[PDB]
Design a protein around this ligand. Structure first.
Ligand SMILES: Nc1nc2c(ncn2[C@@H]2O[C@H](COP(=O)(O)OP(=O)(O)OP(=O)(O)O)[C@@H](O)[C@H]2O)c(=O)[nH]1
Ligand SMILES: Nc1nc2c(ncn2[C@@H]2O[C@H](COP(=O)(O)OP(=O)(O)OP(=O)(O)O)[C@@H](O)[C@H]2O)c(=O)[nH]1
Ligand SMILES: Nc1nc2c(ncn2[C@@H]2O[C@H](COP(=O)(O)OP(=O)(O)O)[C@@H](O)[C@H]2O)c(=O)[nH]1
Ligand SMILES: Nc1nc2c(ncn2[C@@H]2O[C@H](COP(=O)(O)OP(=O)(O)O)[C@@H](O)[C@H]2O)c(=O)[nH]1
Ligand SMILES: [Mg+2]
Ligand SMILES: [Mg+2]
Lengths: 432, 430, 432, 430
């Protein structure tokens, strides 16, 4: 498949990006200096300079120099194009209004210029990849600007985004409920399907599945990088049942306003513990449908699955996949909504996951990534909305947003839009 | 790059300033003569945050030292880091204030304020993106209270968009140092309650307790308390200067810590604080630091936090760290201290982590708390201002300098509103 | 035959398990590190990793880290799957209520999850093996939980359990009469046939038959391991008159409430004393029916045999077995109940017992294990019940059980159930 | 892992504590400076049971030392293992108790109890699964009796689910050490008879006899009796720390030893106890140890066991052992001593074996006995409390501290009930 474009906005997105491109360079054998030295389809994410060099096709953006400064001084400094590392002067300070109205407006024009140049060199553009934090100043306000600009300027193209959905129990900021809803209202229409991941859920995986007692954001991004790699494996390798970028939205978006699938990955085992498990297709296939293995704290058993995409990767046999999927569908504890008799979208690629040196993930020749648009996320939305209205009833932090060029009316409109989204899940969750 | 200018006024202001650049220069490896001797390139990557480079292998800290008498500033010149500052920034008067807010604001300071702003304007013009201001003073003091408020109003008028921090020493409840502290504090709070975005209240009484038991220091002195204060002040801006997994600048703290515009008074804290004998018998790990920072005995404020509730808490960590451990302990504090947080704010903790720790420590954390317990502090001052002003105990000194008695009553009422607004939000929806 | 599952609960069961798997590894030539290096039917008790390694199909469970910690630090540490070694935090403290209501409930869910995964890899599951102490906190309270869970979740499958029946004279705990009856009432319905063994009886064998003057629990487990090995010899080797796992209950359970056979083994001779005995089939066959050789102190002559299973092992000749069995049936001192004209269930396997290095048992090419459901155990039940009512008449230790979530009514109900069991033996012990 | 926190109060409490960690540290090979020097990995496998590890190759015993005067604790600091404990755990007052239960419970100890519980809470929070508490004191003592009971009630209220052991020194019948022992004991038993799960009664009179004849020690001292006591106390928790064929933890002993909730008073014992001359002429084997441990002369309690009966006995062995031999001797004791066990309890012995023996011995055993003979002990105190209280011999000291005379009579009655309940179960069904 042809080119796919990547965008990294905010500290979470930027830090995820360097982990994602660490895998991409390792998978294609590209050195950290931008020269290939160990699969010719790497042009999907890289542009050849014409002099034995490859420039990653990403646009790292932030309103502060700190996070991008690390990239400029890191090992991958020579990799990225200098102009792609667009940076501002002052951070959004966790305020949505700043990243969307005041300071975001000053730097949005420069971002589009680079994005336009990236498109000019495209013989074919499947879509965009946008990495951001669902709750945060730059990752919620500036992303909405790009979504509006990209949709109107380009349109008719897939727009995949990865979001750090706020964990129900764990939270590292105070005004996240305000920030998450504001971006959801503005990004719901211009998005195609946003993959959601929690920090708490990955921590639990790193503690139960993996034997790591000292995890860090660096570990999480490395465990999130393979999620992105598997999703784009078809565009970069060959295998039966190829899944193009645009196929994800068609299969996983029954309705335009329900495009928030969750992410699961398997196997996830340490080097020592791998010796004691066969890791056959049924084992990993069953693991993907375990509450203990999903990367979103919402309980899958609390709702019903509407659509599921199984991107099998490695030395897998299609017959085993069909038998394994049949076993899942006959389970009574698992339940799929009646109006969708067929929910599984299988994808097989002949490229086992690459081993990241120094990582906490063991070498496996057979891995699978599951994307499931499940109604269980409706409970998470209600809890997030419950936080918002409780704060907004007293104007806990509204004055900061008001002074940054955002009218108080948007809070009411945004929550009502969220309320309708809750009703939409309720409507599709029952059948006669 | 995000940049700040530091202002220090009064005796407490300058002395804490002196024990502050003695520590910022240490983190960046800056020699007292001004030449850089750091062992890591990561220190110069963000030196410009506090320093204006002067060609010749030397750096000059953009700081403005204001004092109506030259006694406190003359000692600074004779200090180990006295020659570090630019001589032009040393601006002083001749007739020092007699601990009266009026003289430091209306009569004596009015003539020198023009001179101070000119240096401040040059420092601002020397920057590429000014982020905020920092003021160190003492509410009980006359120069700091009087001259500090005058400077805050002028710079705020000149730079409304920019932030301004204030590390104000607050009068202790039991033992004082100036007779007329109640007048100075109420007059100064009347200005800080509308002009500054975040203020950090510190009291020496609480610092004395820390040294006595938490740190087992037999003969502490202000050379030691200022070191503790400088540690917290440096910690607040660890993010502007060094990298980390979750960076939090001054503005980010202000939005996460200031729910309502008038409720911007915090109580700082620090950890670990252990004596030399206790160093052997304690493990320096995340689980232990979290308990110490939320401990009422580790607070740098006299008011007991348990008598109130926390609207917002911000934790700034330093050193090699594990995010999950940090998340766990904050969750435990949220669940364990069930009644110590307001119900109308589901999340009360703002976490920040930096890679580099302070000095020789392999781990540090700084505590910022916007607790409602601080109402008992203004209430005490509210009672000490009323009792004196009830019969004009010392008003004839302020009146003689031009201040009218009407301004006094407005500040008292503006002080009562602040306490009522703190008690108002201590309630619960159910 | 296909897979059989093993479960080890409690200190007695766990310590027995390491002895049982020592024999299993030796019999199949599996090294203690989980790699075969000297019979391909070893899959009954082992699962192949697919990379030249074998994982024993056992689930070691306990409420304390001490006993399982020894296994984790023992030579067989690399053998077992790390997740199979499920452990709690606080021991049941010899209280049935703790192991069944308070602390047992917290860890029961995790045990079932592993048990479910073991079943998923089964092409055929004959049943379960549960090792526990008939009297003890974890071995009596937690076993009842598993029996209830396994019966309802799986059902329609054999459930064999080995129990350390309290010796009449020797006793190492004070509240055993309370503990033994409570588990008997709850495990009587969900069990198929529980093999019973005493510590005193094995001690007597180690002193009279063997020439060991310093026996230990380690010796007893080694002498009990061959009991389990012989019972499962058919499932792992080939020979005439194969005895499947489900055949035991059909032959040895005339009535649903009488499924408590006792265990006997022969020959049991030291290395030196073996040279002076021929050890022909009649000799070992007659030895199995000797009071001095049975592993339960109850006198076989005090009652009547109802059913008997003779699992001959080694280079035995079927003609000799038939003649030897005929000799037993014509004895007048031995008496079988009239309503069961046929009581002998013969089983022959062509695999002599393996020699355990450092053991006290001599090498014999011809061994036999006898399982006999005899009414003589009724006397033992009455003595155990006699201890219970004597204590319960004064509430000797009831307050401990009451405070652990167990109602006082269960004591009365459990004893009455035991009383009915005594009557059941009386009813089947007479004929017109 | 199962974990315990040790509490020591009063002069006898701390001194026995000091001679207890001098022995626990020896078993685990812990240097007096706190660094580990053990020769076997099996010692560190369960070190956390009594110690909280401090990074740096050192371990700190989680122990709380309480004493109203600092005299006894100051000596501990100067001891060989004084520097092992965390300095913060050393909590003490200034006005020591005058051997009056009232002062150590109501007036003097009430002010310091808050401080003690805070350390205790931190130790509990430092654990992953707290199993129980241990208290060392003396009923005749004022601090231990008074302050020990106050601590037991508070921790029991705070941690009802957790166990708590008590190794209490009981007044001797013939020669005493405090005049007012009868008052202190009765008041303290009134609290221990409902708050603690198991108590071990020890008397120095019995220990003196052991040294004189069983051990042929010409000049014993409390440095020696405490060593014997520490051996039994360490033996009770051999299972929590080292592996064995039949493990018995604190709770297992409590269920096997406490038939009724109020009858939780035991008499400890130890074996072998032989002099240096007698070491040649005795074989250290199971048959000999069983006789020594059931011998009335080897008992650490003045009351003769033969005057009563055993409800429950628990044998904790150590070292290489043979289970059949252990079973044989216990059976012989059951049959030989026909009338020494109650009929309404068919089995009276709870056996436990551990692989590792103590110190240089190749075999050890610890004896715990819940014998009915202990009624003669409370009866004697019951007569000595009545004779004094009959005419208010020393009540004016307790009354002056707040205690009312009514509390005195309730404890006497609660003491008479205990003796009656012991005599009640000494009967036979036939
Ligand atoms: N998984 C993961 N999440 C991260 C990482 N870094 C930050 N986050 C998440 O980002 C959330 C807050 O938004 P940030 O991305 O940190 O802030 P930002 O995007 O830089 O926008 P600003 O407000 O201007 O700082 C936190 O709740 C974190 O969960 C990371 O490295 N990995
Ligand atoms: N034959 C044999 N019996 C044992 C062994 N270990 C313990 N037992 C028996 O177990 C009985 C007591 O129950 P345990 O199994 O020890 O206790 P448990 O199963 O761990 O349950 P808890 O009460 O929670 O400790 C004792 O009377 C012993 O006879 C062993 O290794 N071999
Ligand atoms: N924390 C701290 N407080 C100080 C120090 N020196 C003075 N103060 C406080 O300053 C107050 C007196 O005001 P001061 O600043 O000296 O008067 P000014 O010179 O006119 O500004 C006293 O209440 C002291 O508590 C110091 O070194 N550290
Ligand atoms: N075993 C032992 N007992 C002691 C020691 N010192 C004092 N005692 C006992 O403590 C009792 C006196 O009580 P004490 O604790 O001194 O009074 P307190 O200071 O108020 O707690 C006496 O009956 C002694 O038997 C010692 O070192 N070892
Ligand atoms: Mg940022
Ligand atoms: Mg146990």
């Amino acid at each position: 498949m042809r080119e796919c474009l990547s965008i990294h906005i905010g500290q979470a997105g930027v830090q995820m990006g360097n982990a994602c491109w660490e895998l991409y360079c390792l998978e294609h054998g590209i050195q950290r200096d931008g020269i290939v030295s160990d699969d010719s389809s790497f042009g999907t994410f890289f542009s050849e300079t014409g002099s034995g060099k490859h420039v990653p096709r990403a646009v790292f953006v932030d309103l502060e120099q700190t996070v991008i400064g690390e990239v400029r001084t890191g090992p991958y400094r020579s990799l990225f194009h200098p102009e792609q590392l667009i940076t501002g002067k002052e951070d959004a300070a966790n305020n949505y209004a700043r990243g969307h109205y005041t300071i975001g407006k000053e730097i949005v024009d420069t971002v589009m210029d680079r994005v336009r140049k990236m498109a000019d060199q495209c013989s074919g553009l499947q879509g965009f990849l946008i990495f951001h934090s669902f709750g945060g100043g730059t990752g919620s306000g500036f992303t909405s600007l790009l979504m509006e600009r990209l949709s109107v300027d380009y349109g008719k193209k897939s727009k995949l985004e990865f979001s750090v959905y706020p964990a129900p129990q764990i939270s590292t900021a105070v005004v996240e409920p305000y920030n998450s809803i504001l971006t959801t209202h503005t990004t719901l229409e211009h998005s195609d399907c946003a993959f959601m991941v929690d920090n708490e859920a990955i921590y639990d995986i790193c503690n139960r599945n993996l034997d790591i007692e000292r995890p860090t954001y660096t570990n999480l991004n490395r465990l999130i990088g393979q999620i992105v790699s598997s999703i784009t494996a078809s565009l970069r390798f060959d295998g039966a049942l190829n899944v193009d970028l645009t196929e994800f939205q068609t299969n996983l978006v029954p309705y335009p306003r329900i495009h928030f699938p969750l992410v699961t990955y398997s196997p996830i085992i340490s080097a020592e513990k791998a010796y004691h498990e066969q890791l056959s297709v049924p084992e990993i296939t069953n693991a993907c449908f375990e509450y203990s293995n999903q990367m979103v704290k919402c309980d899958p058993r609390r709702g019903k699955y509407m659509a599921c995409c199984l991107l099998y990767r490695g030395d897998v046999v299609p017959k085993d996949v069909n038998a394994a999927i049949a076993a899942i569908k006959t389970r009574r504890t698992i339940q799929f909504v009646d109006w969708c008799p067929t929910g599984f979208k299988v994808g097989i690629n002949y490229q086992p996951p690459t081993v990241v040196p120094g990582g906490d993930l063991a070498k496996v020749q057979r891995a699978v990534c599951m994307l499931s648009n499940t109604t269980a996320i409706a409970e998470a939305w209600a809890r997030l909305d419950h936080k918002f209205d409780l704060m907004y009833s007293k104007r806990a932090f509204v004055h900061w947003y008001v002074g940054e060029g955002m009218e108080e009316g948007e809070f009411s409109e945004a929550r009502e839009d969220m309320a309708a989204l809750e009703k939409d899940y309720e409507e599709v969750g029952t059948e006669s | 790059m995000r940049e700040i200018v530091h202002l220090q006024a009064g005796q407490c202001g300058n002395q804490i300033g002196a024990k502050f650049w003695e520590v910022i220069s240490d983190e960046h490896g800056i020699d007292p003569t001004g030449t850089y001797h750091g062992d890591s390139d990561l220190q110069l990557e963000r030196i410009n945050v506090y320093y204006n480079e002067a060609t010749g292998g030397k750096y000059v800290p953009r700081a403005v030292l204001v004092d109506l008498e030259p006694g406190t500033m003359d000692s600074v010149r004779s200090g180990p880091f006295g020659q570090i500052f630019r001589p032009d920034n040393f601006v002083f008067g001749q007739s020092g204030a007699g601990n009266n807010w009026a003289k430091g604001h209306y009569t004596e300071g009015a003539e020198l304020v023009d001179s101070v702003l000119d240096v401040v304007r040059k420092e601002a013009e020397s920057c590429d993106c000014l982020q905020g201001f920092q003021l160190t003073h003492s509410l009980g003091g006359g120069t700091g209270s009087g001259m500090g408020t005058l400077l805050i109003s002028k710079i705020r008028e000149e730079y409304p968009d920019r932030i301004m921090n204030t590390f104000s020493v607050v009068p202790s409840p039991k033992v004082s140092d100036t007779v007329v502290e109640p007048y100075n504090a109420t007059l100064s709070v009347h200005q800080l309650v509308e002009n500054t975005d975040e203020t950090y209240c510190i009291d020496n009484e609480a610092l004395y307790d820390i040294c006595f038991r938490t740190l087992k220091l037999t003969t502490p002195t202000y050379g030691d308390l200022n070191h503790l204060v400088s540690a917290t002040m440096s910690g607040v801006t660890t993010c502007l200067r060094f990298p980390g997994q979750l960076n939090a600048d001054l503005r980010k703290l202000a939005v996460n810590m200031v729910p309502f515009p008038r409720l911007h008074f915090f109580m700082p804290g620090f950890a670990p604080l252990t004596s030399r004998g206790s160093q052997q018998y304690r493990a320096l790990t995340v689980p232990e630091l979290t308990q110490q920072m939320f401990d009422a005995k580790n607070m740098m404020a006299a008011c007991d936090p348990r008598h109130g509730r926390y609207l917002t808490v911000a934790a700034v960590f330093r050193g090699r760290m594990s995010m999950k451990e940090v998340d766990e302990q904050m969750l435990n504090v949220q669940n364990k201290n069930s009644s110590y947080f307001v119900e109308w704010i589901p999340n009360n903790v703002k976490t920040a982590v930096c890679d580099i720790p302070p000095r020789g420590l392999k781990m540090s954390a700084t505590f910022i708390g916007n607790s409602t317990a601080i109402q008992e502090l203004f209430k005490r001052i509210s009672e000490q201002f009323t009792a004196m002003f009830r019969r004009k105990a010392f008003l004839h000194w302020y009146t003689g300098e031009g201040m009218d008695e009407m301004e006094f009553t407005e500040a008292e009422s503006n002080m009562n509103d602040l306490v009522s607004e703190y008690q108002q939000y201590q309630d619960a929806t159910a």
